[PDB]
Short mmCIF file of C-alpha atoms and ligand atoms in Angstrom, two decimals:
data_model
loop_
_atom_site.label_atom_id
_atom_site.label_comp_id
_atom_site.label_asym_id
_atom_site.label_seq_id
_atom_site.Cartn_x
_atom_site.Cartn_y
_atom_site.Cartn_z
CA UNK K 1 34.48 -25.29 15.99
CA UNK K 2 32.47 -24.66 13.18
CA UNK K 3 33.18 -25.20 9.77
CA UNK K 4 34.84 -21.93 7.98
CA UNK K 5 33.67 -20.91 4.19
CA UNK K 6 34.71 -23.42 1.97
CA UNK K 7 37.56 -22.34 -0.27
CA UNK K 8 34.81 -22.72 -3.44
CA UNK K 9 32.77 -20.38 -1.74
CA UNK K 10 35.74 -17.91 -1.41
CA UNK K 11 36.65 -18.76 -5.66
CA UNK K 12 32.89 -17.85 -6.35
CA UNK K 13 32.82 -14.89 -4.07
CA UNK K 14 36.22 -13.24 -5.77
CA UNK K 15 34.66 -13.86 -9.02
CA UNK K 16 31.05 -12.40 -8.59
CA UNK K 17 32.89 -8.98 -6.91
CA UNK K 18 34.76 -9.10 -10.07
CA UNK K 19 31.55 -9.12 -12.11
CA UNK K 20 29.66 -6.50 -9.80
CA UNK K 21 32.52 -4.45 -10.03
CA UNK K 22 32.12 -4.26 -14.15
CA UNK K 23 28.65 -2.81 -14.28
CA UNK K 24 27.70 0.56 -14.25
CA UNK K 25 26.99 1.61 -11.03
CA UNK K 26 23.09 2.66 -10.50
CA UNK K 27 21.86 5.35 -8.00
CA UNK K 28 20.68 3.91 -4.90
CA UNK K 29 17.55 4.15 -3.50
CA UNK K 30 17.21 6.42 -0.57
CA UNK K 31 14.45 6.68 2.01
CA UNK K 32 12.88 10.79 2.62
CA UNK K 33 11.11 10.45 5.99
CA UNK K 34 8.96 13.45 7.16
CA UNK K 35 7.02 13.91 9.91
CA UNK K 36 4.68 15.42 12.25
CA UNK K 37 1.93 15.67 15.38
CA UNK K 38 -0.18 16.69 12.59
CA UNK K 39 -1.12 15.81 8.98
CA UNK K 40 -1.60 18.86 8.12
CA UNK K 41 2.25 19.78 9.43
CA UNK K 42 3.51 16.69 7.54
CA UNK K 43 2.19 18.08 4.47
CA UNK K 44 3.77 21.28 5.00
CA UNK K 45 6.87 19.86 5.88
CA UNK K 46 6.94 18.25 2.98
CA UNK K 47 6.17 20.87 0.30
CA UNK K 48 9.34 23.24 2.66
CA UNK K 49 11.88 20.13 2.10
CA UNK K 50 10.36 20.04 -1.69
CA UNK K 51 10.94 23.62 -2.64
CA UNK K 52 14.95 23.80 -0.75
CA UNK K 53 16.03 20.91 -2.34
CA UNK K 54 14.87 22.73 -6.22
CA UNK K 55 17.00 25.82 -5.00
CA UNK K 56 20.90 25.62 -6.33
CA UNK K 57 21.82 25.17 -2.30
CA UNK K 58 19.23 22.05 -2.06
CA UNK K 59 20.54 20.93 -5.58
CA UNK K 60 24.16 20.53 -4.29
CA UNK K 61 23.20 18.28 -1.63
CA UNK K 62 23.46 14.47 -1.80
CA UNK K 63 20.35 12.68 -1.38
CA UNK K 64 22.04 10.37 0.65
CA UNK K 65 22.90 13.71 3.16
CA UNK K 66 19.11 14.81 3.01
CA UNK K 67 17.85 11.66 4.17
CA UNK K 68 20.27 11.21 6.71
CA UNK K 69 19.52 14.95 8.40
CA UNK K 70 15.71 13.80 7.94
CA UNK K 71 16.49 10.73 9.85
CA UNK K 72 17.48 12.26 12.72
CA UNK K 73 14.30 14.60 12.94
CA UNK K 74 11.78 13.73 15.99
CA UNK K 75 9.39 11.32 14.22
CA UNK K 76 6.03 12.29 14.64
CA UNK K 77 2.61 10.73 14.75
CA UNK K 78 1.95 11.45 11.39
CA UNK K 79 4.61 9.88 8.81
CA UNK K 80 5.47 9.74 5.42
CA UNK K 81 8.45 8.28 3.35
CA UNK K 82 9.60 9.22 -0.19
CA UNK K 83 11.75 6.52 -1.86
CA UNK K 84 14.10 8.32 -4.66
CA UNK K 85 17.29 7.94 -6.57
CA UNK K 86 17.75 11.38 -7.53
CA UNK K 87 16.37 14.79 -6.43
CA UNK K 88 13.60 14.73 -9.48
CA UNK K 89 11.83 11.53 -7.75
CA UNK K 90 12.05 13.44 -4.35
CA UNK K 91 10.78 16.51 -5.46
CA UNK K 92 8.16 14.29 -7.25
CA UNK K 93 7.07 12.06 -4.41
CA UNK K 94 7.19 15.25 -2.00
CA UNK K 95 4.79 17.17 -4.00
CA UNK K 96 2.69 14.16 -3.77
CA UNK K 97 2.98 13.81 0.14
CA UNK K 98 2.45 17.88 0.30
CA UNK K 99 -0.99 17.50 -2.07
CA UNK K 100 -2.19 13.95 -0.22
CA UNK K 101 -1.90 12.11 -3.75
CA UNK K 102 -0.85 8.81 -3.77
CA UNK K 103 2.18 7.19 -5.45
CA UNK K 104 4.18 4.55 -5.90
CA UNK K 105 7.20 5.36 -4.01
CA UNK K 106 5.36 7.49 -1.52
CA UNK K 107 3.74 5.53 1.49
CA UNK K 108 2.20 8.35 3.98
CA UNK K 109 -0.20 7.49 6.70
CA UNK K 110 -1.78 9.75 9.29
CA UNK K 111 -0.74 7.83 12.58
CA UNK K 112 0.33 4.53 13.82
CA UNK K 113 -0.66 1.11 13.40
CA UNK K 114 -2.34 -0.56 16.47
CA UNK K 115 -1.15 -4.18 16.15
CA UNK K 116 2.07 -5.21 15.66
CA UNK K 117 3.08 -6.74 12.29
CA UNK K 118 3.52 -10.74 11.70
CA UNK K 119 6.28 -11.80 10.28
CA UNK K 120 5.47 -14.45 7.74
CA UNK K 121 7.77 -17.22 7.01
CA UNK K 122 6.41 -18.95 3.85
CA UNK K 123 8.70 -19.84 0.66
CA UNK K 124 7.27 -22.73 -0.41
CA UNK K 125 7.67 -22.13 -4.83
CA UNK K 126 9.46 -19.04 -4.38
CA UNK K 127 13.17 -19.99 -4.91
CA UNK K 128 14.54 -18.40 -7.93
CA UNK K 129 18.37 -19.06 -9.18
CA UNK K 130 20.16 -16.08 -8.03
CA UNK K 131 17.99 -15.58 -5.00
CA UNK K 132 20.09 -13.92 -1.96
CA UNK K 133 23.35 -13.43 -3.69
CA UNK K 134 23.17 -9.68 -4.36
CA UNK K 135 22.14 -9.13 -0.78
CA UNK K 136 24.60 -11.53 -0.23
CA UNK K 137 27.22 -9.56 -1.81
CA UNK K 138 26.97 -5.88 -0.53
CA UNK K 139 24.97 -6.34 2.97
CA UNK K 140 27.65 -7.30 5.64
CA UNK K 141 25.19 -8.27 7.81
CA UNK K 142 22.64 -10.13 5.96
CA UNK K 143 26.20 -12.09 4.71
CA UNK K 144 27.38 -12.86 8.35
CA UNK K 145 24.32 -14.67 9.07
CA UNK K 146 24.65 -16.65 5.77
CA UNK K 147 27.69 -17.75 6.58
CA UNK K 148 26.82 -18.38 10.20
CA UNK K 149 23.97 -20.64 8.57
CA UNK K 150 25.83 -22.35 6.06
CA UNK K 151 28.42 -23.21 8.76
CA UNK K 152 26.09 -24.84 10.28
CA UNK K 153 24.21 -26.36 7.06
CA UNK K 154 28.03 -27.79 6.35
CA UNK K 155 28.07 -29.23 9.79
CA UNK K 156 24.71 -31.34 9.57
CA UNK K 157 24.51 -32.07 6.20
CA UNK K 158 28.13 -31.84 4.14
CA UNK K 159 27.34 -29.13 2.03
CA UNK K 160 28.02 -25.06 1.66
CA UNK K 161 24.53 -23.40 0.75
CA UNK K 162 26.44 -20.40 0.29
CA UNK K 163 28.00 -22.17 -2.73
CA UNK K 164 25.15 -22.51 -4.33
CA UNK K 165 23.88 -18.84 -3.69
CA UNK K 166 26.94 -17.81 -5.41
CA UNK K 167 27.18 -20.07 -7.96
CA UNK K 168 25.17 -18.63 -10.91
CA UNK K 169 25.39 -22.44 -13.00
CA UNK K 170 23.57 -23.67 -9.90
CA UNK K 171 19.61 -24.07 -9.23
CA UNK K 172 17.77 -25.87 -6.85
CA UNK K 173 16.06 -29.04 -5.92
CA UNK K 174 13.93 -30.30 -3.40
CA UNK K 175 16.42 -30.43 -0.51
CA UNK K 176 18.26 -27.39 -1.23
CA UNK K 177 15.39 -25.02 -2.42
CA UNK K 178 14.63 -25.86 1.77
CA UNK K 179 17.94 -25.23 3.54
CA UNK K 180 18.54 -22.32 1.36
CA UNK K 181 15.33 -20.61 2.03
CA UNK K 182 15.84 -21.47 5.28
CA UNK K 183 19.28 -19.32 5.48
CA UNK K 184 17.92 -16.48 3.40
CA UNK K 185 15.44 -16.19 5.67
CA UNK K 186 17.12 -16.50 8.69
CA UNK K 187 19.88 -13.74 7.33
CA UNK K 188 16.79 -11.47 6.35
CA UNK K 189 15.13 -11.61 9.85
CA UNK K 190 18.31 -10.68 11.46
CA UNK K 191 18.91 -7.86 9.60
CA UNK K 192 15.75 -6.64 10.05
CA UNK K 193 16.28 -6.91 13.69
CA UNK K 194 20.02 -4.73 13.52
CA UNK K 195 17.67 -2.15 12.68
CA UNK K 196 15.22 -1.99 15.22
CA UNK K 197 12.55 -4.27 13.77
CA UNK K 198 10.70 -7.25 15.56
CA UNK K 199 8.00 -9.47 15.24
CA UNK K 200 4.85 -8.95 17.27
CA UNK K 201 4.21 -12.79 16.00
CA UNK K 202 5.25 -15.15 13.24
CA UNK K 203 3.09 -17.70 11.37
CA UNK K 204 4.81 -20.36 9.25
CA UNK K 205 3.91 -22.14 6.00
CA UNK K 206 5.51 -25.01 4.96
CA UNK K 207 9.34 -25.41 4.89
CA UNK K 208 9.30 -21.65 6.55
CA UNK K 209 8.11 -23.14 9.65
CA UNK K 210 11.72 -24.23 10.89
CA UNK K 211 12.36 -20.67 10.53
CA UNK K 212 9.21 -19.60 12.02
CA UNK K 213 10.57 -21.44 15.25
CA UNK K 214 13.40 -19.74 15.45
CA UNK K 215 11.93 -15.97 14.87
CA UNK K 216 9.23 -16.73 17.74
CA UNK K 217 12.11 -18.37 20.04
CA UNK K 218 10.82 -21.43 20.43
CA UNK K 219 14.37 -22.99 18.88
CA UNK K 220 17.81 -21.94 19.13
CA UNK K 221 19.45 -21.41 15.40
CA UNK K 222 21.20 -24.76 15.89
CA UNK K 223 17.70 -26.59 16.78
CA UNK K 224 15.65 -25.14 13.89
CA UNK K 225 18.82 -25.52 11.14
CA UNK K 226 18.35 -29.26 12.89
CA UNK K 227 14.79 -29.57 11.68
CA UNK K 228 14.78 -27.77 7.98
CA UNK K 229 18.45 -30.22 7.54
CA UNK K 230 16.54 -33.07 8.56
CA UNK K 231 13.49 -32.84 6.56
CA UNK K 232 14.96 -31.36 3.39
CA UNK K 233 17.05 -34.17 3.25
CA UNK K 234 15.09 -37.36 3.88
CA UNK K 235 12.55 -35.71 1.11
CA UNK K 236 14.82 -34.58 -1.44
CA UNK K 237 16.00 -38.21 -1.12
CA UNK K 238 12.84 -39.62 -1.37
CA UNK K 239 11.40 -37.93 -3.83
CA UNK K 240 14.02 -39.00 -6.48
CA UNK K 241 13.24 -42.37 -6.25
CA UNK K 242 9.77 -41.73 -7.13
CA UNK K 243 8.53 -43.23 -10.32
CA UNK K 244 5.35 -44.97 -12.12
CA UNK K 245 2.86 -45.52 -9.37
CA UNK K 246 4.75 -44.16 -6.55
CA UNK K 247 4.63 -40.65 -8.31
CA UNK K 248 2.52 -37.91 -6.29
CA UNK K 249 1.97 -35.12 -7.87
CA UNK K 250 1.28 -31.09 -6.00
CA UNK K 251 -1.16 -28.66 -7.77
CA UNK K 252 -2.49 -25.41 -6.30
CA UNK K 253 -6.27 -25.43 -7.61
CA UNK K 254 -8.72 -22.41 -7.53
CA UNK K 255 -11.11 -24.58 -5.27
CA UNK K 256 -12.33 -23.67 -1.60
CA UNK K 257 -12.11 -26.10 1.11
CA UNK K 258 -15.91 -26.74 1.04
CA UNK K 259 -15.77 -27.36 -2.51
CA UNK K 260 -12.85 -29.51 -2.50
CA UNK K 261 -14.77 -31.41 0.28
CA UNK K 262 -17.60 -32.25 -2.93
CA UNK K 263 -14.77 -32.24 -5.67
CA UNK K 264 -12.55 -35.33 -4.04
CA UNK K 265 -15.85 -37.49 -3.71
CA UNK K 266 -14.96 -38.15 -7.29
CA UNK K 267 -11.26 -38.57 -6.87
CA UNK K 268 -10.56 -40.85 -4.12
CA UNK K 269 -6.68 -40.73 -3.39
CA UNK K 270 -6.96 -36.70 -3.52
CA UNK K 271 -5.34 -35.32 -0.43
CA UNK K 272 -4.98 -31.24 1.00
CA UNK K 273 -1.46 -29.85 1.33
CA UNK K 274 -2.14 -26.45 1.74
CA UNK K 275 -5.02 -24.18 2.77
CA UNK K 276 -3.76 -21.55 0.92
CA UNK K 277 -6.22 -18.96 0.63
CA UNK K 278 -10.42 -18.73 1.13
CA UNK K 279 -10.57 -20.03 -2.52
CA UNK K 280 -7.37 -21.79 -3.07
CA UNK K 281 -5.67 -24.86 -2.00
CA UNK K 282 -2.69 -27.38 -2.81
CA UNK K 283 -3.40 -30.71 -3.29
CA UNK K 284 -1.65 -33.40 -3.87
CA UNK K 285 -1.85 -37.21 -5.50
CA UNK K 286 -1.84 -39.94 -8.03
CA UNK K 287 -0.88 -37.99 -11.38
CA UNK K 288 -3.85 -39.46 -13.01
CA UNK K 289 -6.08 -38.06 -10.66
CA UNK K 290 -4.49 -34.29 -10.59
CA UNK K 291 -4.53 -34.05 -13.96
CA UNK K 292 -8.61 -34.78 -13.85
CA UNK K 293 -8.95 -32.51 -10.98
CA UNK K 294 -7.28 -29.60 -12.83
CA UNK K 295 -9.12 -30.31 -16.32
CA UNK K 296 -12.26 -29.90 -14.23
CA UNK K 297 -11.00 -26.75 -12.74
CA UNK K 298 -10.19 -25.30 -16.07
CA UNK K 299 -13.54 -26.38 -17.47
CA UNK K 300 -14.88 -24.29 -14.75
CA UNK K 301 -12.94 -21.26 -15.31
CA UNK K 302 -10.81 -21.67 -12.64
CA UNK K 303 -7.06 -21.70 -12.00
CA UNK K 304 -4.95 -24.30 -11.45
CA UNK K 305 -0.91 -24.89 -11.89
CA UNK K 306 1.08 -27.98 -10.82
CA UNK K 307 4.48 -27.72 -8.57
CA UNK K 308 8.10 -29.49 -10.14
CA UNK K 309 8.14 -32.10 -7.70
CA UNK K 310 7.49 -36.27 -7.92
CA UNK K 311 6.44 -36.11 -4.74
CA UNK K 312 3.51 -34.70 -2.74
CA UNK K 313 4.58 -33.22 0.94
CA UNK K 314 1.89 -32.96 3.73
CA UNK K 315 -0.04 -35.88 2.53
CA UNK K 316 0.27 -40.01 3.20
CA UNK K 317 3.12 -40.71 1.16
CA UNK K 318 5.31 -38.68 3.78
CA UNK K 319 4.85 -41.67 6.51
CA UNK K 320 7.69 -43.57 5.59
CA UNK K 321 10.04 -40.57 6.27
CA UNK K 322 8.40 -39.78 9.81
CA UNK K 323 11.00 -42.94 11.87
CA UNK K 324 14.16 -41.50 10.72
CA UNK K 325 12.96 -38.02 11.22
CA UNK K 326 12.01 -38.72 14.48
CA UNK K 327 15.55 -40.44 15.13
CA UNK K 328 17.29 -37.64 13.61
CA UNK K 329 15.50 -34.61 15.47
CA UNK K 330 16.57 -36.73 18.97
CA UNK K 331 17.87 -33.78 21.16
CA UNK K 332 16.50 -30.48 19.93
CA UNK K 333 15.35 -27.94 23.07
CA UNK K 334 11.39 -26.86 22.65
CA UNK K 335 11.98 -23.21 24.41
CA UNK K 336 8.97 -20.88 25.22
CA UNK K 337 8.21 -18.42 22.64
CA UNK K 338 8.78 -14.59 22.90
CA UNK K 339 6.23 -13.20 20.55
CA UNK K 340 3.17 -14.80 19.22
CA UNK K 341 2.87 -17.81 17.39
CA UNK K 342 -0.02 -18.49 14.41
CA UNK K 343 0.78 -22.33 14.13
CA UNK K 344 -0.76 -23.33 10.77
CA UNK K 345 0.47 -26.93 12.06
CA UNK K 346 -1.84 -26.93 14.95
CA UNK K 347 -4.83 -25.98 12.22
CA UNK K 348 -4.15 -22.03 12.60
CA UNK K 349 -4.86 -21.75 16.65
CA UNK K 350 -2.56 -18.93 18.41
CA UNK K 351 0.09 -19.73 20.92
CA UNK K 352 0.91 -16.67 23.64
CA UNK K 353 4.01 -15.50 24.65
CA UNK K 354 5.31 -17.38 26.97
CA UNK K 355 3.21 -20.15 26.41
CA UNK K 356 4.22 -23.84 26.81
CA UNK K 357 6.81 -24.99 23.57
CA UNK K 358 5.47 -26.49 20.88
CA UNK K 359 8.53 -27.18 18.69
CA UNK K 360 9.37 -30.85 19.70
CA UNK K 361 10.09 -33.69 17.28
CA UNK K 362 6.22 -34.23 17.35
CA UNK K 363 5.66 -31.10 15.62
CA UNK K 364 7.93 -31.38 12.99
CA UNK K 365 6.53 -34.35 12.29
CA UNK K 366 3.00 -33.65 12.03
CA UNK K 367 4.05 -30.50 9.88
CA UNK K 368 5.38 -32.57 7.55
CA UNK K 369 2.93 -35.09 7.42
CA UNK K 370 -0.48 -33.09 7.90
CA UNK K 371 -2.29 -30.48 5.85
CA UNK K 372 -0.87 -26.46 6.45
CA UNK K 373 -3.85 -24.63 7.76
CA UNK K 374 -2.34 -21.13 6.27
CA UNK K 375 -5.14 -18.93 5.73
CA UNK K 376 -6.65 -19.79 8.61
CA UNK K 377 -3.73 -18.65 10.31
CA UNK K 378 -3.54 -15.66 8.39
CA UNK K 379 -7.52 -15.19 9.60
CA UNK K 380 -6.94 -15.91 13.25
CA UNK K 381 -4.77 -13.06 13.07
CA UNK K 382 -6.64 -10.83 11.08
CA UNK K 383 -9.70 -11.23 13.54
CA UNK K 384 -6.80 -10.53 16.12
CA UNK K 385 -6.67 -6.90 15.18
CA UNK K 386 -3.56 -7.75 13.03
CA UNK K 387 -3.03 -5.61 9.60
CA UNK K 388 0.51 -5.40 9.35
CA UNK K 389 2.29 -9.00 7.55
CA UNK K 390 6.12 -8.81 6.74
CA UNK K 391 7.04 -11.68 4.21
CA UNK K 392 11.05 -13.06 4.57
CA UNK K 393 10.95 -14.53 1.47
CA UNK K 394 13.35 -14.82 -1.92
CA UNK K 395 10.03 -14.00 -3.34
CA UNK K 396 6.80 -12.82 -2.57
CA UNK K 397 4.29 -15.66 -3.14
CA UNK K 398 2.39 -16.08 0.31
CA UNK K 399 1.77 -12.16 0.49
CA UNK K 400 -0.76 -12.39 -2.52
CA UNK K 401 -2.14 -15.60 -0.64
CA UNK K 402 -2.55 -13.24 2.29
CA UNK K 403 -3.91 -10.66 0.38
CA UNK K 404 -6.86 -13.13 -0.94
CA UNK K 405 -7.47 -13.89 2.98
CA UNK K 406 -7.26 -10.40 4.57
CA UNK K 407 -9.97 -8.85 1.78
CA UNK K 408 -11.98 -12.08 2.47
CA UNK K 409 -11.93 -11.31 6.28
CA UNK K 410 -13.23 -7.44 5.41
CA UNK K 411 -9.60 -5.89 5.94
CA UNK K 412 -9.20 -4.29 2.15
CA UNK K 413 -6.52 -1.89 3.55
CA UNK K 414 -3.86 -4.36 4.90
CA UNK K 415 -0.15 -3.35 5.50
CA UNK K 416 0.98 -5.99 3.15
CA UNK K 417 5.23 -5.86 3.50
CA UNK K 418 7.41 -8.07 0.87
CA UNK K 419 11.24 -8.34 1.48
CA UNK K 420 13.31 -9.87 -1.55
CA UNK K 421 11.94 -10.64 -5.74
CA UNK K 422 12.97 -12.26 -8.27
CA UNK K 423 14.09 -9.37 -10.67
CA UNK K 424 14.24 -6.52 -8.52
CA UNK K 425 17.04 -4.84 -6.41
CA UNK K 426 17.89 -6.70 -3.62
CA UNK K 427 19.43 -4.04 -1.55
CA UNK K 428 16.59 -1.73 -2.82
CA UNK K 429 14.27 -4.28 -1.59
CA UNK K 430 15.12 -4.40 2.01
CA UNK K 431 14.91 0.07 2.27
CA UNK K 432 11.46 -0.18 1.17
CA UNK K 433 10.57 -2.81 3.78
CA UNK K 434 12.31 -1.10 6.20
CA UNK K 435 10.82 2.31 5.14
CA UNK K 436 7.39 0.97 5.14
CA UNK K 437 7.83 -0.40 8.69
CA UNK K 438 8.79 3.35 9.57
CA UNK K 439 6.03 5.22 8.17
CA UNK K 440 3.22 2.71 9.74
CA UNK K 441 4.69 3.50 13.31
CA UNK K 442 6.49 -0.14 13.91
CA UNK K 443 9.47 -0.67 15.60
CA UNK K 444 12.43 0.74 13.11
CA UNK K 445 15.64 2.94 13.73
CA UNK K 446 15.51 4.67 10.59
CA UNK K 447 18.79 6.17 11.53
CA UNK K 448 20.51 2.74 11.18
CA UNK K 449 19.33 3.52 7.30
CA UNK K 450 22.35 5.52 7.21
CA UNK K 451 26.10 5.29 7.96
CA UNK K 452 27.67 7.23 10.47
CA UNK K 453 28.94 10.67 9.00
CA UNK K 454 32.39 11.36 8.73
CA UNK K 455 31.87 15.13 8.41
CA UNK K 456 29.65 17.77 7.51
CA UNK K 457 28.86 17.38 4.16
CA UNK K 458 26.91 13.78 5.19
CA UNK K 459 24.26 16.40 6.63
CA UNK K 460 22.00 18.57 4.77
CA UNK K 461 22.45 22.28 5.65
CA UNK K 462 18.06 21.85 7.11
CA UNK K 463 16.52 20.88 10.30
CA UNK K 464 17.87 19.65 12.86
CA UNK K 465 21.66 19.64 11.00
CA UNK K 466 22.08 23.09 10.19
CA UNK K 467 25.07 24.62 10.29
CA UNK K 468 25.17 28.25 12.35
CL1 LIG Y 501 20.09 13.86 18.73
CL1 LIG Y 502 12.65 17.50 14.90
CL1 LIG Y 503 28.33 3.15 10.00
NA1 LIG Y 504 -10.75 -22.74 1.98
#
């Protein structure tokens, strides 16, 4: 069967519940959802559920109790969510729903969105040390698919990710930034899908594609753990033999496509990585050459920041690991997809549900080896009738990337989701994604936002809990 957690990952574990058990214990953050046919109902709702909960009754109920009466409420056309730790944000963000104001841990919209959301899978620099292990640590089901990950990370490459996720002395390199990633995002899509959530279609960037496959069901979990193992490896192990001349480096420069078509006529071994954004791509190359290409940049006002890496993925100098990739992806099962697909491997072009697979060995190694055609992905879908992107990420880069491409395309009032960042609450984190998924009409039980009660005083003495 497959490997069990390792007995290091069991030491860590005791001693970072040792650790979390030390601190003071902050208030969580709880999600208010109101609702109704009508705006103008919603609002009213809202300033009702405002004034109870200043009276002494309202004041000697948990938040946790209010929002789980709220949750069971029909939810209406029109939505809003307050996000509070204590009844003074509540009141605060209700008074805001009641008077239409805006704020920022008040999302209210007047009906649904059309489209579906996409469900981006990026993560390319956006691993951070801790990244996953609070999450890790008090959700029990973004931790069983961690572990069911890292079993299977132990089984193809020899190693526990989840080690490393606990293991605070421990950061990442090139292989591991991918596998981890990988199983962060993986556990984060799954527990987005206990409660209710699904992609209407996935686009992939990078060394999120392997998990891109396996969101749009074009890979079982064993197939695409088979292609981020088997790529992360041959690169990491690459790219620390790199030195002098064989050095590549990867910079993200504030230059369009059509001007990095005129720029590179004056650097010649220049090659795309990423298509980023309308005005900003990675490149990648001789060190000589990057560092001319970003002093121009800079001497044009324009930014430009290189990536830690000796190597320079999605360009030339990834042809030598394309045979043993090939040899070691021998077997994976290329299954239709069941939502859509945005490949930015196949230049950004949109594959149906139930279309023919595209995820054999071929495609992972033409991902690997060819440029990542992201924002046109992310304008494909936006010309789609798409507003709605969801991020799985340890960190939010690719949202701001898709932010640069949806006001580019027109669409300057996108439903722009992140998950997980470096620096804020984890499990905070995931209830506003979830809320926000709520209050723009996409699939979420927002009763799966609570636990089950265990008597009457886990309901709020309002409607549709009151007690006769
Ligand atoms: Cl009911
Ligand atoms: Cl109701
Ligand atoms: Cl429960
Ligand atoms: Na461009």
């Amino acid at each position: 069967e497959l490997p069990g957690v390792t007995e290091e990952a069991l030491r860590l574990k005791e001693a970072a519940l040792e650790e979390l058990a030390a601190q003071e214990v902050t208030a969580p953050l709880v999600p208010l959802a109101v609702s109704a046919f009508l705006t103008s109902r919603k609002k009213a709702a809202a300033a009702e559920l405002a004034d109870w909960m200043q009276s002494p009754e309202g004041q000697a109920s948990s938040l946790e109790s209010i929002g789980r009466s709220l949750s069971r409420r029909n939810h209406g056309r029109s939505r809003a969510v307050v996000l509070a730790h204590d009844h003074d944000e509540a009141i605060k963000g209700l008074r805001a729903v009641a008077a239409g104001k805006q704020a920022p841990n008040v999302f209210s919209v007047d009906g649904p969105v059309t489209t579906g959301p996409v469900w981006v899978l990026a993560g390319f620099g956006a691993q951070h040390r801790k990244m996953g292990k609070s999450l890790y640590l008090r959700n029990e089901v973004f931790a069983a698919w961690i572990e069911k990950v890292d079993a299977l990370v132990q089984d193809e490459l020899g190693y526990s990710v989840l080690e490393l996720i606990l293991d605070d002395a421990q950061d990442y390199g090139i292989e591991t930034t991918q596998v981890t990633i990988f199983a962060i995002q993986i556990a984060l899509g799954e527990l987005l899908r206990h409660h209710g959530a699904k992609p209407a279609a996935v686009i992939g960037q990078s060394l999120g594609e392997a998990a891109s496959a396996y969101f749009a069901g074009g890979l079982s979990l064993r197939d695409a753990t088979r292609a981020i193992c088997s790529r992360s490896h041959l690169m990491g192990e690459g790219e620390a033999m790199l030195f002098g001349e064989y050095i590549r480096l990867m910079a993200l420069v504030e230059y369009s496509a059509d001007e990095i078509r005129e720029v590179f006529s004056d650097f010649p071994d220049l090659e795309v990585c990423v298509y980023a954004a309308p005005t900003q791509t990675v490149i990648g190359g001789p060190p000589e050459q990057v560092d001319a290409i970003l002093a121009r940049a800079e001497a044009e006002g324009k930014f430009a920041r290189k990536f830690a890496t000796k190597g320079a993925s999605h360009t030339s100098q990834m042809d030598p690991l394309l045979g043993e990739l090939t040899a070691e992806l021998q077997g994976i099962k290329p299954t239709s997809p069941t939502c859509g697909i945005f490949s930015t491997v196949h230049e950004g072009r949109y594959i149906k549900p139930g279309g023919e697979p595209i995820h054999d060995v071929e495609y992972w190694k033409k991902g690997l080896r060819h440029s990542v055609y992201f924002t046109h992905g992310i304008r494909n879908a936006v010309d789609s009738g798409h507003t709605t992107f969801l991020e799985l990420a340890p960190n939010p880069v690719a949202l701001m990337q898709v932010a640069l491409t949806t006001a580019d395309a027109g669409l300057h009032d996108a439903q722009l989701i992140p998950t997980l960042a470096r620096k804020q609450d984890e499990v905070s984190s995931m209830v506003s994604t979830m809320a926000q998924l709520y209050v723009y009409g996409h699939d979420l039980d927002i009763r799966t936002l609570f636990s089950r009660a265990s008597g009457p005083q886990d309901y709020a003495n309002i409607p549709p809990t009151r007690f006769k």
